C-alpha cells in the first residue's frame, strides 16, 4: 500500500536528517551531560549546536533563555503556574488574559488557576475567525499579570495579530506569552518583533520527535521553576537532559526554518489546489478567514455529513486527517506531501462525499 498523511497539525514525521542526527546519542554517546568525565563532556558541542539552532529559529538573543522541555504542554503549564506564583500571589496581580482559541494545556491550566482564585478572562472569537488586539487592550486591567495568545490556531490555521498584541502588551506593562506551537516551520517566528516574554513550541509539529519542546524566556524575566531540583538549564528546569531529542530538535528547527519559503510557495500552493478542488463540491464552505492562515492548513465543512464520518471513510482509503470546531474536517499538509497525493485526495474525498450524502 501507498498511504497519504494529512494530519500534520496533530504531529509530523521525524525528518530523516533528524533521525540520523540523533542516532549516535542512542548508540555510544550516552553519557550524562552533567558528568565531569569524557562521556559527559563529549556531549557538550552537539548540545551547544542544537541550542544555537533553536536560538536562530526564533530570533532569540544570547541574553535570552530557550529552555528545553518535555513538550509544549510542559511549557504552557510552566508559564501559567509560574506567573501565578510570581505575579498573582506575590504581586497581587490577580488576572490573566487569554483566548477561547487556546490549546487545552493553556485553557485547563487557566481553569485550575480560577479554581484557586485567579480571574481569567477568555477572549471570545470573532466572525473573521480571529482576535483583534484591541480586544486585549480593553481587557488589560491594573490586576492583569499575563496575556497569553497563541501565534497560530491548530484547528483553523488562523494567525493571530501577535506583535500588535506585543505592542499593546509593552505599552501597558504586562507579561506576554505566545504559544507558537503551530507557527514553527509554517511562517517566520521572531520573539523580537513579537515582544514575547515567553514563547512555547514542541518539536513534533516540525518534524522532530514527540516528547520535547522549548520555552523561550526573555532576559531578566523571572519564572519560578515548574521542575525544581535545579541543576540543568541554568536551574530553570531540572532533569537529566534528553540529549538525543535535543540534538534532533535542533536539526528540526533548522530545517523547519530553511523550508519557510518552500512551505509558503509549494506546500501552500498544494493546500490551495486541494481547497479549490474541494470548494467545487456543493455546500462545502471552508472554515474561517482564508487570507491570514499558515500555509499548510484548511478546515473544510461538508453540507450534510459529519466530520467524523468523512474522516472514517478517508481512513479506509488510507488517507489520514482530523476534525475541528463546527463538525468540520481539517487537512494539514507538510513538505512531505506531493501533487500526486493531493490529486488523489481530491478524488477519494469527492467519491467519499458523493457516496455518503444519501443516508
Ligand X SMILES: Cc1ncc(COP(=O)(O)O)c(CN[C@@H](C)C(=O)O)c1O
**Binding site listing for pyridoxal 5'-phosphate:** 72-73, 154, 182, 202-204, 240
Question: What is the CA angle 272-273-274, rounded to 5?
Answer: 90
Applying CB under 6 A, does 103 fall inside the site for ligand X?
yes
Count of CB atoms within 10 A of residue 240's CB? 11
- What is the CB-side half-sphere exposure of residue 39 using CA atoms within 13 A? 6
Residue 27: name its binding partner from Cl ion, ligand X, a second copy, none (Cβ under 5 to 8 Å by kind).
a second copy
Cell numbers describing residue 80: 501559567
Q: How far apart (Å, rounded) are the C-alpha atoms in residues 162 and 178?
A: 8
Nearest Cα to 7, choosing from 339, 345, 348? 345
Q: How many CA atoms lie within 13 Å of 144's alpha carbon, on the beta-carbon side?
A: 23
Nearest by Cα to 107 from 95, 117, 99, 115: 99
* Residue ranges in 192-221 that form contacts with ligand X under rule CB under 6 A: 202, 204, 213
Q: Is 245 in the site for a second copy (CB under 8 A)?
A: yes
Contact criterion met (CB below 8 Å) for 47 and 244:
no
Residue 38 interacting entry, from ligand X, Cl ion, a second copy, none, C-beta within 5 to 8 Å by type: a second copy
Known binding residues:
72-73, 154, 182, 202-204, 240
Q: Pick what 181 binds: ligand X, a second copy, Cl ion, none; C-beta below 5 to 8 Å, kind-dependent.
A: ligand X
Q: Which is nearer to ligand X, 165 or 181 (CB)?
A: 181
Write down the least CB distance from residue 134 to a second copy, Å. Answer: 29
C-alpha neighbours within 13 Å on the C-beta side of residue 201? 30
Which residue's CB is nearer to a second copy, number 126 or number 315?
A: 315
Q: What is the DSSP letter of 65?
A: E
Q: Is residue 155 at the binding interface for a second copy, with CB under 8 A as the rule?
A: no
Residues 51-70 that bind Cl ion (CB under 5 A): none
Binding partner at 14 among Cl ion, ligand X, a second copy, none, C-beta below 5 to 8 Å by kind:
a second copy
Draw the binding track, 77-106, toward a second copy (x: CB under 8 A; -: no contact). Answer: x-------------------------xxxx
Nearest approach, Cβ of 125 to Cl ion (angstroms)? 28
Binding residues for a second copy, how many (CB under 8 A)? 70
Q: Sheet containing 213-217: which strands, arranged edge to edge? A: 65-69, 213-217, 198-202, 175-179, 144-148, 95-99, 119-123
Contact code string over 69-88 relative to Cl ion, x by CB under 5 A:
------------x-------
What is the grid cell recorded at 47?
548540545
Grid cell digits, residue 262: 518552500
Nearer to a second copy, 28 or 283 (CB): 28
Q: Is the sign of the CA dihedral 316, 319, 320, 326 positive or negative?
A: negative
Residue listed under C-alpha cell 512531505: 336
Contact 250, 51 (CB under 8 A): yes
| 239 lies in the site for ligand X, by CB under 6 A | yes
Q: Which of residues 8-37 bind a second copy (CB under 8 A)?
A: 10-14, 19, 22, 26-28, 30-32, 34-37
Q: Is 67 in the site for ligand X (CB under 6 A)?
A: no
For 205-239, b/e burial (b = at least 16 CB within 10 A) is bbbbbeebbbbbbbeebebebbbeeeebbeebbee
Is residue 348 close enough to count as binding a second copy by CB under 8 A? no
Q: Which residues bind ligand X (CB under 6 A)?
A: 9-10, 71-73, 103, 105, 150, 154, 179, 181-182, 202, 204, 213, 239-240
Contact residues toward a second copy (CB under 8 A) are: 3, 5, 7, 10-14, 19, 22, 26-28, 30-32, 34-40, 69-74, 76-77, 103-109, 111-112, 202, 204, 209-212, 224, 226-231, 238-245, 308, 311-312, 314-315, 318, 320-322
Contact residues for Cl ion, defined by CB under 5 A: 81, 226
Amino acid at each position: 500500500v501507498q498511504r497519504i498523511y494529512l494530519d500534520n497539525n496533530a504531529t509530523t514525521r521525524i525528518d530523516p536528517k533528524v533521525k540520523e542526527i540523533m542516532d549516535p546519542f542512542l548508540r555510544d554517546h550516552y553519557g550524562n551531560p552533567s558528568s565531569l568525565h569524557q562521556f559527559g563532556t563529549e556531549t557538550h558541542p552537539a548540545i551547544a549546536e542544537a541550542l544555537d539552532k533553536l536560538y536562530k529559529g526564533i530570533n532569540a538573543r544570547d541574553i535570552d533563555d530557550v529552555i528545553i522541555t518535555s513538550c509544549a504542554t510542559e511549557s504552557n503549564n510552566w508559564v501559567l503556574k509560574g506567573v501565578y506564583f510570581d505575579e498573582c500571589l506575590k504581586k497581587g496581580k490577580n488576572h490573566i488574559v487569554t483566548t477561547v482559541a487556546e490549546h487545552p494545556a493553556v485553557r485547563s491550566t487557566c481553569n485550575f488557576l480560577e479554581s484557586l482564585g485567579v480571574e481569567v478572562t477568555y477572549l471570545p472569537i470573532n466572525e473573521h475567525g480571529s482576535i483583534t488586539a484591541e480586544q486585549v487592550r480593553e481587557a488589560i486591567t491594573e490586576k492583569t499579570a499575563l496575556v497569553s495568545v497563541m501565534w497560530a490556531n491548530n484547528e483553523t490555521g488562523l494567525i493571530f495579530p501577535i506583535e500588535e498584541i506585543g505592542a499593546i502588551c509593552k505599552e501597558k506593562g504586562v507579561l506576554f506569552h505566545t504559544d507558537a506551537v503551530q507557527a514553527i516551520g509554517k511562517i517566520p517566528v521572531d520573539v523580537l518583533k513579537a515582544n514575547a516574554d515567553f514563547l512555547s513550541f514542541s518539536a513534533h509539529k516540525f518534524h522532530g520527535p514527540k516528547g520535547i519542546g522549548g520555552l523561550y524566556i526573555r532576559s531578566g524575566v523571572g519564572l519560578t521553576p515548574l521542575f525544581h531540583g535545579g541543576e540543568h538549564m541554568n536551574g530553570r528546569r531540572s532533569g537529566t537532559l534528553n540529549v538525543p531529542y535535543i540534538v534532533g530538535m535542533g536539526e528540526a528547527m533548522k530545517l523547519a526554518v530553511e523550508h519557510l519559503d518552500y512551505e509558503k510557495e509549494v506546500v501552500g500552493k498544494l493546500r490551495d489546489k486541494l481547497e479549490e478542488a474541494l470548494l467545487k463540491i456543493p455546500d462545502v464552505m471552508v472554515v474561517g478567514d482564508r487570507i491570514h492562515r499558515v500555509p499548510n492548513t484548511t478546515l473544510v465543512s461538508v453540507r450534510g455529513i459529519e466530520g467524523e464520518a468523512m474522516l472514517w471513510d478517508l481512513n479506509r482509503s488510507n488517507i489520514a486527517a482530523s476534525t475541528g470546531s463546527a463538525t468540520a474536517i481539517r487537512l494539514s499538509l507538510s513538505r512531505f506531501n506531493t501533487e500526486a497525493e493531493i490529486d488523489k485526495t481530491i478524488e477519494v474525498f469527492s467519491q467519499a462525499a458523493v457516496r455518503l450524502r444519501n443516508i
